[PDB]
Design a binder for this molecule. Structure first.
Ligand SMILES: CC(C)N1CCN(Cc2ccccc2F)CC1
Lengths: 86, 103, 141
């Protein structure tokens, strides 16, 4: 089961609902599509990678790789992550 | 082995995972379950390269090294119109502002 | 409250740093005071002579970000079974995306320019609330 997160510029990101629920904000918006008027797609795509990363590596004993963040998107990703509570 | 993918067409991006041993066709069934277009109406690409339905994702270059949760590999998707396949078009994501001087 | 027990029963320990960070091992002494030990470069190991009931935690040596050791917060050398050293496998946690962003921003902006960044005021304060072992020790407490 999937949900659709739409970026400020209209890109549609289709991710597993369980991955999207990493964000408590997204959980409330879903309780299915969500429109993010303030998160552009180059940020929202990284947020989606983060969900995948978080769900894959939470509770795993393997060595966990660093979640990589380009300096150029650090600030917007920070504000998106702050809003999304994740 | 799980590989982590962004399946992309136009302004659509599907985040999903699949086994390295699964086939391009089985990925099309995944796409069909999500976007409701049957496999015969889909073409899947890595870069500009059309992918063979019977090939596994690993043989198509999707491996634990190249298709990571925090850095998924991109699969291009193109749909068939009326017996004619559209050209592969993937709209880029937006651009970040220029780096602040303070960074 | 969070302190090493003075057992004086040796316990052989291997610190393996399975993280890309320079790791600062921290021993909580018998008064609960954190004592830094020599840093482990990323991916390196180090044999350590410690003691049963001693208390360790691990941080990025440059930034003091928290690290996990054997998937939890604190490492306590136990009995060496069949005389084999106990492993302290140090890993990155899954940081929240917010904290991970704070890490990258802090690592790119010297703290004298946090206010010169165009963000909400609450993020300005979050940037400045650098991770630090004393604060973490009160949290665990
Ligand atoms: C009372 C005396 C025997 N202490 C002094 C403190 N030091 C603790 C220690 C040292 C070196 C590595 C790990 C440790 F945990 C050695 C034990």
């Amino acid at each position: 089961m999937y949900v659709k997160l739409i970026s400020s510029d209209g890109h549609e990101f289709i991710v597993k609902r369980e991955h999207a629920l990493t964000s408590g904000t997204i959980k409330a918006m879903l309780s299915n599509e969500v429109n993010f008027r303030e998160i552009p797609s180059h940020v929202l795509s990284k947020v989606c990678m983060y969900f995948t990363y978080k769900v894959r590596y939470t509770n795993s004993s393997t060595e966990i790789p660093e979640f990589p963040i380009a300096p150029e998107i650090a600030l917007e990703l920070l504000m998106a992550a702050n809003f999304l509570d994740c | 082995m799980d590989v982590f993918l962004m399946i992309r067409r136009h302004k659509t991006t599907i985040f999903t995972d699949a086994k390295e041993s699964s086939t391009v066709f089985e990925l099309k069934r995944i796409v069909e379950g999500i976007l409701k277009r049957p496999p015969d109406e889909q073409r899947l690409y890595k870069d500009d390269q059309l992918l063979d339905d019977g090939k596994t994702l690993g043989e198509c270059g999707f491996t634990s090294q190249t298709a990571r949760p925090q850095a998924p590999a991109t699969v291009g998707l193109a749909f068939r119109a009326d017996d004619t396949f559209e050209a592969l078009c993937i709209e880029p994501f937006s651009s970040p502002p220029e780096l602040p001087d303070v960074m | 409250v969070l302190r090493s027990v003075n057992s004086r029963e040796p316990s052989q320990v291997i610190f393996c740093n399975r993280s890309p960070r320079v790791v600062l091992p921290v021993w909580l002494n018998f008064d609960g005071e954190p004592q830094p030990y020599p840093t482990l470069p990323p991916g390196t190991g180090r044999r350590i002579h410690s003691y049963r009931g001693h208390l360790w935690l691990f941080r990025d040596a440059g930034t003091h970000d928290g690290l996990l050791v054997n998937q939890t917060e604190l490492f306590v050398p136990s009995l060496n079974v069949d005389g084999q050293p106990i492993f302290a496998n140090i890993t990155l946690p899954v940081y929240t995306l917010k904290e991970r962003c704070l890490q990258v921003v802090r690592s790119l902006v010297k703290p004298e320019n946090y206010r010169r960044l165009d963000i909400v005021r609450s993020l300005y304060e979050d940037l400045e609330d650098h991770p630090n072992v004393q604060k973490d020790l009160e949290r665990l407490t």
